[PDB]
């Protein structure tokens, strides 16, 4: 035999171990249309109809945005837009209400409830109206048969809708 001494400078006493991490995907859509009818006398919504262009998704990650258009997600080639249609606004008070409407993702439609929170109603600089509200609510991928190939382990069944609107009177 023969005795050696490590060259600590070119020796690595190393290990690799696999772990999981949970993270939130946050995103919006750059491109959408809405019709908003609101009565500031009573702080009631009268009509709220939104159309979102799936193509315009942005989750801060180019390769993921593309992947979202594919058959295993939005299938934007066949179903290029998602639509929301208000069916009912039930006032709680002037800051708060329960909105019920039809969401349609990739041709499948379900009625969902959003929590309307009016964060401010005003007359503008120019004497024409503004409003600022939010719509919050949880929907389930499974209720919309959405991204069914992807497990509820890898990706949560719960999607959190966070709609923030500043909006001005018309004509």
CB atoms under 10 Å from CB of 112, counted, come to 19
β-pairing, 96-105 vs 108-123, is antiparallel
3-state secondary structure the chain: CCCCCCCHHHCCCCCCCCCCCCCCCCCEECCEEEEEEEECCCCEEEEEEEEEEHHHEECCCHHHHHHHHCCCCCCCCCCCEEEEEEEEEEEEECCEEEEEEEEEECCEEEEEEEEEEEEEEEECCCCCEEEEEEEEEEEEHHHHCCCCCCCCCCCCCEEEEEEEEEEECCC
Q: How was this structure determined?
A: X-ray
Alpha-carbon distance of 120 to 134, in angstroms, equals 10
Structure tokens at 52: 């979102």
Residue 113 lies in a domain: yes
Confirm whether 8 is domain-assigned. Answer: no
Distance of CA 72 to the CA centre of its chain: 18
- Report whether 20 contacts 34 (CB < 8 A): no
For residue 120, tell me if it sits in a domain: yes
Tokens of 167: 């909006």
The answer to whether position 14 is within a domain reads: no
Q: Which domain holds residue 74?
A: 22-171
Residue 91 and residue 43 in contact, taking contact as beta carbons nearer than 8 Å: yes
Q: Which of 79, 78, 146 is nearest to 112 (CA)?
A: 146
Angle formed at CA 148 by CA 109 and CA 135, multiple of 5 degrees: 45
d(CA 71, CA 54): 13
50: domain CATH number is 2.40.128.110
**Residue in 74, 44, 40 with CA at minimum distance from that of residue 59:** 74
Q: How far apart are CA 83 and CA 135, in angstroms?
A: 15
Q: Number of structural domains, the chain?
A: 1
- Whether 5 maps to a domain, the answer reads no
Please, are residues 119 and 132 in contact by the beta-carbon 8 Å criterion?
yes
Handedness of CA 128, 134, 140, 146 (dihedral sign): positive
163 in Cβ contact with 132 (< 8 Å)? no
């Amino acid at each position: 035999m023969k005795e050696y001494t490590l060259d600590k400078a070119h020796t690595d006493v190393g290990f690799k171990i696999k772990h999981l991490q949970i993270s939130n995907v946050k995103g919006n859509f750059k491109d959408y249309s809405a019709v908003i009818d609101f009565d500031p006398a009573s702080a009631e919504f009268k009509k709220l109809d939104v159309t979102i262009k799936i193509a315009s998704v942005n989750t801060e990650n180019q390769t993921r945005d593309n992947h979202l258009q594919q058959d295993d997600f939005f299938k934007a080639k066949k179903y290029p837009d998602m639509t929301f249609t208000m069916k009912k606004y039930e006032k709680i008070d002037n800051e708060k209400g329960k909105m019920t409407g039809t969401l349609t993702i990739a041709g499948v439609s379900k009625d969902i409830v959003l929590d309307a929170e009016i964060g401010g109603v005003a007359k503008g600089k120019d004497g024409k109206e503004k409003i600022g509200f939010s719509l919050n609510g949880k929907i389930k991928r499974s209720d919309f048969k959405f991204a069914t190939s992807t497990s509820t382990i890898t990706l949560s069944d719960d999607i959190n809708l966070c709609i923030e609107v500043e909006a001005n009177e018309k004509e």
